[model samples]
Target chain A: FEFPEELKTKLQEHINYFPKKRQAILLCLHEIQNYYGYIPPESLKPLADMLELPLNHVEGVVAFYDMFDREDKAKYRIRVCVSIVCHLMGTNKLLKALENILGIKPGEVTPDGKFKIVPVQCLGACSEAPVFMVNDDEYKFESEVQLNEILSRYT
Target chain B: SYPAIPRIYAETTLNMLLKRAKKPRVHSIDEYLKDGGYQALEKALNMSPEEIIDWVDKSTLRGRGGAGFPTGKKWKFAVQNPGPRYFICNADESEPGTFKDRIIIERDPHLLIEGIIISSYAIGANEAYIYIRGEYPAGYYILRDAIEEAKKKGFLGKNILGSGFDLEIYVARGAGAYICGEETALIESLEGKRGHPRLKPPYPVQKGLWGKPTVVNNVETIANVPFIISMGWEEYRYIGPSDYAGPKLFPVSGKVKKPGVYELPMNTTLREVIFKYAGGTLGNKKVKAVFSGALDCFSSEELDIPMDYSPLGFGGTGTVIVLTEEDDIVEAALKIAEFYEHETCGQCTPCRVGCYEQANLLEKIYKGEATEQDWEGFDFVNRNIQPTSICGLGAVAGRLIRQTLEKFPEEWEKYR
Candidate 1:
């Protein structure tokens, strides 16, 4: 995560969005992620520094939500939905295909360092059985052939 | 018991495909096309974008998504955007107690494809993404089969129907973030980033997915695109209620003799949907509360009210999660609140942090550990989350808390 001058303004704006300084804690971390590409423990101190609040207050907010990838996220994150819908629809088969083709499991990044795979619970597209989402692009109605073809485009 | 489906989930779509395919399964593209798939898109292709836009405007088509924004107006925003805009179908239907999108994807994947093609064409978009939720196994299969069939028939691809219009749609599954229902968060998830809501003014219209102007619509919203184009806005508008207009899909579950889905004209009263369409509550069980939409629900005696997005009234997902006399409404609310709290993306402190606190308060109340002040804390958290957070995830807590406070005050009284 690298933040120069560009994110400073957005970060400050996020702090100002709330009437109470404590409310700014969540957006502050999101800004840190925007600027640096991931939220760092060091950034938690800034809420207290910028909002004149305590450090624990900020940490309390960050630790609550599952979406906060508080740790270092790979440059290209590929989170796969292997929830009930994905699992029942053979997302494991899809995952196996990806790992066999790309040589990575649900939580590991490819050896080439191009992508990382993370498994999630459910995506709500149960109708489109065997669905997998990557970086805002979803491959639904997918088979190994279609999966491989789409993967080639990304690679 | 899950209960036999007294009503068809999506009768029009199911019957249309069933009749056309003359078969039990709608598994292949030929099956869908044989029954009149993409005819709407083909119809849309012949008309000028203005004509289609005008038709939508006249049809009085409101978005099937809870907000009910005028469909024509949303298109106007996209068409007006001066860039290579994107068309996003919000296939991420993670709204609790609701599963309308699942039926569409599972049984009639082509229905969405047909709608997407027409919607993209109307807004001048060449690329579309059906942002499906990760939990639906059946949806992935239906969409995959339908999309491939659509591709083979030249309904989608470089050139469609010799009409010189080109567009491509792919499914994008959301990885377990409830907040992804918020358009911006969905976009963020789509961009291979954390699924959190973004500030408005950009509004996914001026700046959206991939940092481009985009048109994001709900599954139901996109499903209606072709119909608006073919039937004209006036004809469609004539079918439903005026103030909160458009046809609606209802997914009724819990303590019902027949829990399934139904498509009714907008403004259908809750009573009719529950008693008539869904075969009423379970044997000897009185109805206790109803969750109209996904986020926040209502549980007062006002169960007979019409279901629509009145903002003041509870209506969004068009779902009716029925609780019976034997069921615990307080416990139900507690569980639902905990869900929102757990799923809060933590983009705003008031929501991410406050939701968990509120959930704790609710649980304490359930266990007789809540105080009068704890009840106040619930209200405090609910009120603070709104207008402060960027998206509906924050706004939704207000409704849930309000519903809980109003419907189950005795539970709160125990705290006092």
Candidate 2:
């Protein structure tokens, strides 16, 4: 398996912060997901060997977190906050608007592979309700028109 | 218009925690020091650990992280235990309506730093960790920079202020797990494991963060330490109720005209909080109900009930989400059900299965296809889940759904 030199360097820096090398597994997985867009199957053996953990242990960590994506689904994973506050504030409307425009419901990628919209739990920014995060950037929307305007820029 | 946008009505005594929140760049150590910062640490370093604990006890400061456990007693337990102790700040604010902690971390990160230094010294811990949630990218960066700034200023690290005490602070991030907000689960995630809730009898005070005596506190709870030390407990007591001292930060959101985080006196009536402070429901919508905290929904009539933890009342994470008449209660219940179902750690059978089953029933109720037996199943799960569950997550699995159904029986019974 070919590991990027930059990814190896980043994993080394993260490993130094933790007392036990195995503790860096999640952070390392994050780096992998960020670098490769998803945790490719070939990347796992190298990560397990680098962290000096069993393959199953590293696999378990990846599966446990919602943030980690196992397959290359989309270029931008759009997560909308469907928790109580955001739902109350009409996030569902914004979600439906996206579904109508994109011709796909949540949890399904656009046929063009441009985006994948999924409803997430609270994004910790309830004061700015009806929020969504594209990749890692959080966008707070008030109305469906504003959401459409925001989505146009990304496309 | 909008009830004059209730400004953070300080009760005249406890504003120190939010003193520099509105000001820009107070996050810098230099700016923070110029504004009478580190004075509390100097005074605290001079006093013995027991004395600091005593002062906090006199102040009657409760944990601001939903549980409302007395902060003084939590520290005392760790202080009494053997050494090699740990101090952690639960910065993972994942509750649906809670954003108060993120405000402090973003605007005045140094205040949280000073609080950690004082709390660590009082608990006899040399190292501290702030377990921040991953979604808070902005807050996580701000706190990381704050810790570095404090280290360079000699406010942290070896022999702080020539007191012959050494301390170090680290920032750890959670990978988007709401369960990690639970104190024990926070510890588990800090250890780089799945964020599972641990069993009690060896509560965090006894065995925590590497099997040693540890004190885990909420961001707001620890931020109050400096204020209690600087202003005597006598003065602090006047800010809130006669029993629980110091002001509380209530994050009021959803259907409010002017939604924001406000630092108000404790025991402030929900009516004052929602209508006056948060500018009431948006668009003149009659408030059907409001969630006192994250989990419990109360009818609009109960808005007059004081927002507090006294007498075993509501304060389920210090967040108030208003539900206007236009919002569907059943949809809200279904969403909350989905939240707990997705978040359960699955380590315990009761919470793991019970939350999923409850969510299914709530879905049926939402789709207008629920049988009467489904309601009975919910009641059975409510009674059985808490007793057999290991931690607070499982114990409160059936909380919000049950409360919503009971509070709005007509709405819930429509399907039946």
Candidate 3:
């Protein structure tokens, strides 16, 4: 779980942005996850060590936020907003549609492990009504056609 | 193909914050400068800190992040507390129905940057941060790049325009937590801990962001700094009502005809925001409910009342999510209940347990299996959480249940 010197150098630079090094923890986690697709449980202690914070403190953060994944998620993680707006806009039917297309339900992965579908709270993109994010990109959940089209581009 | 952002609409006179929205490069520094962007910094540099605070206070502008604290008083308090202070712009636009801050940052990053700079100078903060949501990767980058541009122009760092004042602004992102929007939790999360809010009395103004006096203003609230400094607060206060400020960005989405943003005055009614601006509900259907803030639902019949903010009138963050006749209000309430349950930080007994129980009770009601026993259970969970829980999340947890049930009791008839 040790980062290469190249990444360690960048993480060090992230620390310089804040007066307190621990302030960079979430930013560093975002970068590490960007490179690794998810935060490896193995990386927490070292990240804690790198930031000069407690291991539990770093772990506490990773576990708290919805975006930080400790386990290895599928390459494409589809997060649909089921908060009131999306619920009113048909999140239930959209979840059903994704299940029909992927042969998996929310909190489950596809056969190929290409996608993991999950339900989340408001994505803050409530204007578009039913919205979901594939990996880091958000898309309006139009239909199975649009879902498959978005899914096709991945893996 | 990219999705279309709502076509920003405002009458020409009302385009104070969004004047540059139609620019070829919306985030371009040169265009922002040409269109009178950093004029506030030049003016703010000359004005005494107290004078600046005086204008903000006299202007009657309040926090747009749903807290509605007067920015002037917050700054006055920070000035009173002494230096090594910090200014944080809360860009964590996670409210379920709010996107005003996101719109301001993405479309007019420099406007926000100028606001931050002026605000920091007013509060005598040498260091500042924009704690944005991690969901907004594009916005995070947009703000970061905009900072670089401002620094390049000598608008951000060292002595600027020979004023001898110095400041540096940084962009920080929260991975994904709603609780962090609370000023205390935002400070704790900024310090690399789990985003948990602390008790008040030693409020952020007294001790914040590393125990120094700090000011945390919403993006929209900070963005108003440039305008208030540019135009005298005397002139600015008259923009809306005598008290509520003008040219506010109200995001009217969900079941609307025009689902973009309106930069209208605060006095604008729900009728105009919906029918005149949003062009009414989709398919021109009857309006069933409107969520002015989370759970602050308004019936179609209640549109004319001013925050005199909605029937209960919180206007939470000037965010409106319209619901039409075809929609299900009961299911909507359940979804909101679940949102609270899901987002509760779990630090307290009442918020953690009550949010869960509230959602569970709503689930039963939605399933048409709940009776008087279940109804009373729902009522009790809300009553306890309102007073017992730690933060606003707990206090307003019962709003949706209370408003929806009372405003449209018929919507819950079958379940009852």
Candidate 4:
């Protein structure tokens, strides 16, 4: 497995950010995930080798955090907050609407490879209930009309 | 003719943290300096470390992160420990409804930066880390920019303000792990390992990151430092109730007209906040129950409870998830149960297995498929889980199920 020059430089910067080489595992994985839509197995060995840590150590940390995905899927990932607060405010309906509109189940990829919708916890934005994050842009829909308006822009 | 009605509830007051929040460029260092930002750090730097610690102690500032331990005493432990020390700002605000810390990080990043500098100076630590949650990309970028600005202005990094004190602050990110909110688990995650809680007695203060003495504090707790330094403990102590001093940021949500963060005194009552401040329930819908801080679930019958550190007392992560009469209590509890089930680190069998079992039982009840045997099993697990669980996560996992069942038995009966 080979790392691109850009990725190698970014990984080096991430490694230097921490006190120990082993301490950069999470961020390094984050960088790898950023470079390739998901963390491909081919990339993990190079990352483990670059950080000078065991492959299992790198894999364990990746497995522990939910943010890293093993499979490369969609261009846009939609995460709907469905914790206690959002759950009360009808996140189920919002999620269902998203699933039907996107033509994908919670964890399944769309046939078009444009979107993936998943239900996430809390999101720390309960005040704006029934919120969803489309790749980091978090917004709340006052109505299905508003949700449709936002969803159209993504495609 | 009728006389004007006299006031019934205490007036709401906003100061310090939330006061400067809405100002233009409040996130910028220049704007922060214009409103007397680093002046507290300047004052703190001149005072002896003991003097600074004494003032924080005198104010009796409690940890804003769930466990209300004394902030001064926590720093004191790190100070007393003989070794290189570290300070971590627990910015991983993942407690369901809580976003007050995210507000501080986003709206007023410089103030938090100033607070971190003063805290590190007070605790004799040269390096500090703010472990921000990865979900908050805006906050992370804002903090990243703010740190760069602070370092450029000499408020951070070597010899800050020529006080002969050197400090470096780094922002670490937590990648979607709720367990990392626990201080020990957070420490482990910072060291680039799985965020698993360690056994107590050798607490974080004694042996933390890199086997060094470390003081891990919540973002709000450290953010209060600049206020304590500037206002003096005497005045700061009087802001809230004498028992638990200082203003609190309560993030009220669910069924309220104005469901947002409200900065109120610590002595504020639950009813006053929900009715008077939060503008009551939307459409005047009756509140069936309210979960204060996402963990302290109580029915509307106890709406008069105070908002302090005391039991029936609330203020963890400062999130209040209100359930209206239109909402179903059993389903909400089941969702909360599922969250605990998913987030459990699988380190302890009681919490790991107990949470799964609790969620399973709640799901059955939610689906109207629960048998009497399921209820009995739930009762048994709720009773047995806390005693054997290693961390607060397991203990808290049982609370929602217990509270929802006990407080709203009628709702559970309907489900059954």
Per-model CA lDDT versus the true structure = 0.66, 0.79, 0.81, 0.82
| Candidate 2 residue B55 C-alpha distance from true site, Å | 1.8
Worst 10 residues of 3 chain A by lDDT: A68-77
Native contact fraction, candidates in order:
0.05, 0.60, 0.71, 0.72
- Please write out the lDDT profile of model 3 over residues B1-416, one tens digit for every residue: 22223333332238787677533134669978887889888998998877888988888888888867888998998899877999999988888877677777877899999989888888889999999998877778778888999999999789977898889998999887999999999999888888898888798999998899999999988878888989888788879788677567787778987776667787777788888877788888988888875748888897875441323443677788888888888888887888888888988888899989999988987887788899889878877776656678888888877888788877777677
Instruction: Encode model 2's per-residue lDDT on A1-155: one tens digit a residue.
Output: 87878889998887776667776767787778778767788888888888887888777777787888786557777888888888777787878888876777778888787888877898867777777887766777767687777778776
lDDT digits (tens) for residues B330-375 of candidate 4: 7888888888888999988888888889889878877878899998
Q: Across the candidates, what are chain A's individual TM-scores?
A: 0.76, 0.90, 0.89, 0.90
**What does DockQ give for each predicted structure?**
0.05, 0.49, 0.61, 0.52
Write candidate 2's Cα lDDT for B1-416 as tens digits. 00011122221224566677744233578778898888989999999989999988889999888888898899998888898999999999888788788777877888899999999998999989898887776676778788888888888889998998889887887787899888898888777778878888798989998999999999999888888888877887877788766878888888888787778787788888877777777888899988755578888877777777866555666688888897888888777778888998888788888888888877876776777888778667665556667788887767776788788988766656
Model 1 - which docking category? incorrect
User: What docking grade applies to model 2?
Assistant: medium
Residue A139 miss distance in model 4 (angstroms): 1.0
Q: State how far residue A93 of model 2 sits from its true place (Å).
A: 2.3
CAPRI tier for the interface of model 3? medium
Error of 4 at B237 (Å): 1.4
Order of candidate numbers by TM-score, starting with the best: 4, 3, 2, 1
- Lowest summed lDDT across 10 adjacent residues in model 1 chain B is found at B1-10
Q: Could you tell me the TM-score of candidate 1?
A: 0.70
User: Which one is best on lDDT?
Assistant: 4
User: Per-residue lDDT for A1-155 in model 3, tens only?
Assistant: 67988878888899888888988998899888877767878888888888998898888788898888777557777887878777877788789888888888888877776788878877776767687888677777878887788778777
Question: For model 4, what share of native contacts is present?
Answer: 0.72
